Design a protein around this nucleic acid. Structure first.
Ligand SMILES: [Zn+2]
Ligand SMILES: [Zn+2]
Lengths: 91, 51, 135, 95, 224, 104
RNA sequence: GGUGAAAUUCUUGGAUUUAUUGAAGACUAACAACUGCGAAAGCAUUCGCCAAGGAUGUUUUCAUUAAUCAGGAACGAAAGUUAGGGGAUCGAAGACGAUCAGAUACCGUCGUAGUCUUAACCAUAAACUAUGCCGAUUAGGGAUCGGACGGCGUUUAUUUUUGA
């Protein structure tokens, strides 16, 4: 009862569009439909609404994030360095 | 104001001339970087997302 | 024209000789890198082309450096001898030995000689490959 | 260190979990130490400390999230605040 | 190679050069190290503009007339120029290339550390320091090695000492501590309980940022 | 047949060691399979010192000698005659060559 | 500049060399050794946090719970593949300069993939001690790393114990 062996979420596309494109869109589609744990209230009730907007179903707060992920590696690195940079500069 | 900022920070929606209300980097996922200052005859050099 | 001083005190310069394994540069300037005083290379001294890195060419170059320098009104020199360095050999070229001593033979005062070859601390990969120059 | 001291309390002494129950207990005036998580709503945070100052009971700002505090009290659910009615043989109230 | 150069590319510029005198800061004895060259002052090009950004390399043995400290050379930056004289102050220290290589030897243990420091008054500059293990007169063992756990201990005290005495100082009084090697002696006497740690030295000093100009303080310390 | 009991490298008790560049050809060799030479040579010969000494800047002093450390791959080493082939029994002998203190 | 010696390439729009400041990426010289740790591949700058391990000490505890393993499983240098980031230095392919009768090479100037990193694949090496794992007995010696024990001395320590 696995119904597949490798296709996964990209099984709706049947036999169209070519193997490599189907396999390559899976990377973003699987993480876009997922569900993440909130940061303000702690519940696991965060889902995507628009192309860059995320919102918690329980506290009703809304946050601007990545395109297909609640956060992106580039943004996280910048915040850490900037926080480190500011503290030493003001000390 | 971009003069009260140390070198290395990334910003967005920069004004090409003070008051034009934002012209430089304002698309999805891009930024500009400051490189160095000039306290005398105040002027700042920046790097744009195209190089 | 050139400013004078009392007989007891003298004046100092510093020469920056660059002696690789293919040529030797004789180059005198003030206690700085600014205001070049004189500079002559082996290629205007020899014409055989087999000696451009020889001590023989070095002495010919050092002589005319010493000659033209003394009229400008310098009497003593500091010496800065440097090889290629970095990823190079760090061994001063053969000409370098001849040039430095030959200054005493010309009678110009020599003071405070030193070597400033640039040595790395865990540098990048170096030319040649994995098997080196295989000849 | 703080986790270890807290683990001992729940085995020996008695403790009450949750927002309303601590406020009722604090209201009775027989609390001795309250714990505050890090990601609680700021309005509750400021209100809880105000009651503590009035009752003259010490407050401790736990450094972890509300999920972590729960797993340190040994339960299987989230928790935001808690109150210590009495210590057992430990020494939390020393500092 | 006269034949070479087939594609190819007023004289005697010296007629417009001028020699100037240079002077040295307060604590040192001799304040005259040589002459310097520059084009003559003229229209379209002042002379102060060429002298406002130069630095000179002078040996501390020459400045102090004492051959014991003959392995450290320092650099001086020129700031202000009066009539045919250049006033200067401190701009860094350094050893000689050859000496650093003679210090290290096989069958020993080398310990190194680094620290930046700033005083109450604005002066950002960094200090370097080194030490070596010392043998025992009645020793037979040929290695003389310490243990890792011990090695980490040495640095924490070593790091602590430099900051403590360099916190409350000025440029003049800190230099007055460098010239008699107060740092090296204090380190030795503090680490003797754990391990000998011979041959302590500060390699060189280099500055990173400077405060406002304050010509008053320059002329206060210099030229008396 | 084994020619050396230590395989000519002297490494027993580790996986490998990071290599290094031969100071003559720039070949790569492991740090333990390398001929190392330490040298303490003067700036110049004694003959130069006398000319140097007469124009002494300060009192009477000697310009400090330099210290070098050279590392060679084995093929270049025995072409420059730093070391050479020994005999069947002379191979297994690791004492430094004795230096005559009187030179006849 | 570069070679056994030439030659490409670059230059008064100042090469090369000198000094101060800044940016990028890789790497932790010397100390470094018949010296250490890990199952192997491998692992070297400081500090903080997180978990792990051998030996030693022991008049603590359980009590045969053990050894090697067909199939089965985890890790597995370098090169190589798929998408991003980054791309300083070296440098497959390739273009030029020389040598040579020829030289698709060895010598020189550039230089793409790659060399770095993130998320996934590949599972081979002279992966060498060319020497499988557990256990018992058998000859003399001096060095060396970690722990413990005994001892006359020395060394410098708000010292004495301890350290060495
Ligand atoms: Zn929420
Ligand atoms: Zn070689």
């Amino acid at each position: 009862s696995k119904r597949t062996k490798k296709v996964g979420i990209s099984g709706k596309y049947g036999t169209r569009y070519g193997a490599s494109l189907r396999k390559l869109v899976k990377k973003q589609e699987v993480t876009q439909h997922a569900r993440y744990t909130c940061t303000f209230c702690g519940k696991n009730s965060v889902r995507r609404t628009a192309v860059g907007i995320w919102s918690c179903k329980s506290c009703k707060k809304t946050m601007a994030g990545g395109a297909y992920t609640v956060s992106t590696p580039a943004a996280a690195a910048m915040r850490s360095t900037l926080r480190r940079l500011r503290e030493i500069t003001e000390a | 104001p971009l003069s009260s900022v140390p070198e290395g920070t990334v910003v967005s929606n920069v004004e090409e001339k003070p008051g034009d209300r934002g012209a430089l980097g304002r698309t999805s996922g891009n930024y500009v970087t400051v490189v160095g200052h000039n306290p005398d005859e105040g002027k700042t050099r920046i790097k744009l997302p195209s190089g | 024209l050139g400013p004078q001083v009392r007989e007891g005190e003298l004046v100092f310069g510093v020469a920056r000789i660059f002696a690789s394994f293919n040529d030797t540069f004789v180059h005198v300037t003030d206690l700085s890198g600014r205001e070049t005083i004189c500079r002559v290379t082996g290629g205007m001294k020899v014409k055989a082309d087999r000696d451009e890195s020889s001590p023989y060419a070095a002495m010919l170059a050092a002589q005319d450096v010493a000659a033209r320098c003394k009229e400008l009104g310098i009497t003593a020199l500091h010496i800065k001898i440097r090889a290629t360095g970095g990823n190079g050999t760090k061994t001063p070229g053969p000409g370098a030995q001849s040039a430095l001593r030959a200054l005493a033979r010309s009678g110009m005062k020599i003071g405070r000689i030193e070597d400033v070859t640039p040595t790395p601390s865990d540098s990048t990969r170096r030319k040649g490959g994995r098997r080196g120059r295989r000849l | 260190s703080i986790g270890a001291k807290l683990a001992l309390v729940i085995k020996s002494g008695k403790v009450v979990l949750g927002y309303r129950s601590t406020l009722k207990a604090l209201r009775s005036g027989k609390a001795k130490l309250i714990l505050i998580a890090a990601n609680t709503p700021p309005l509750r945070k400021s209100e809880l400390e105000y009651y503590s100052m009035m009752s003259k009971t010490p407050v401790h700002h736990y450094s972890g999230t509300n999920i972590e505090l729960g797993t340190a009290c040994g339960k299987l659910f989230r928790c935001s605040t808690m109150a210590i009615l009495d210590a057992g043989d430990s020494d939390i109230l020393a500092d | 190679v006269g034949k070479n150069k087939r594609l190819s590319k007023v004289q005697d510029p010296f007629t417009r050069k001028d020699w100037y005198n240079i002077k040295a800061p307060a604590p040192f004895a001799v304040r005259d190290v040589g002459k310097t060259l520059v084009n003559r002052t003229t229209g379209l090009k002042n002379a102060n503009d060429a002298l406002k950004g130069r630095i000179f390399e002078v040996c501390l043995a020459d400045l102090q007339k004492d051959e014991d400290h003959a392995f450290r050379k320092i650099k001086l930056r020129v700031d202000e120029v009066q009539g045919k004289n250049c006033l200067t102050n401190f701009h860094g220290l350094d050893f000689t290339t050859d000496k650093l290589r003679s210090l290290v030897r096989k069958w020993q243990t080398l310990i190194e550390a680094n620290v930046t420091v700033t005083t109450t008054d604005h002066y950002l500059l960094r200090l370097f320091a080194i030490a070596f293990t010392k043998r025992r007169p009645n020793q037979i063992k040929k290695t003389t090695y310490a243990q890792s756990s011990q090695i980490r201990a040495i640095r924490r005290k070593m790091v602590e000492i430099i900051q403590r005495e360099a916190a409350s100082c000025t440029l003049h009084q800190l230099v007055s501590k460098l010239i008699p090697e107060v740092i090296g002696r204090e380190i030795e006497k503090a680490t003797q309980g754990i391990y000998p740690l011979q041959n302590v030295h500060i390699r060189k000093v280099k500055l990173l940022k400077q405060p406002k100009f304050d010509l008053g303080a320059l002329m206060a310390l210099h030229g008396e | 047949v084994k020619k050396r009991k230590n395989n000519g490298r002297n490494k027993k008790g580790r996986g490998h060691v990071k290599p290094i560049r031969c100071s003559n050809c720039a070949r790569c060799t492991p740090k333990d399979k390398a001929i190392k030479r330490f040298t303490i040579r003067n700036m110049v010969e004694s003959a130069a010192i006398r000319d140097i000494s007469d124009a002494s800047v300060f009192a009477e002093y000697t310009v400090p000698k330099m210290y070098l450390k050279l590392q060679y791959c084995v093929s270049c080493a025995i072409h420059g005659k730093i070391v050479r082939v020994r005999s069947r029994e002379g191979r297994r002998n690791r004492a430094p060559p004795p230096r005559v203190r009187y030179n006849k």
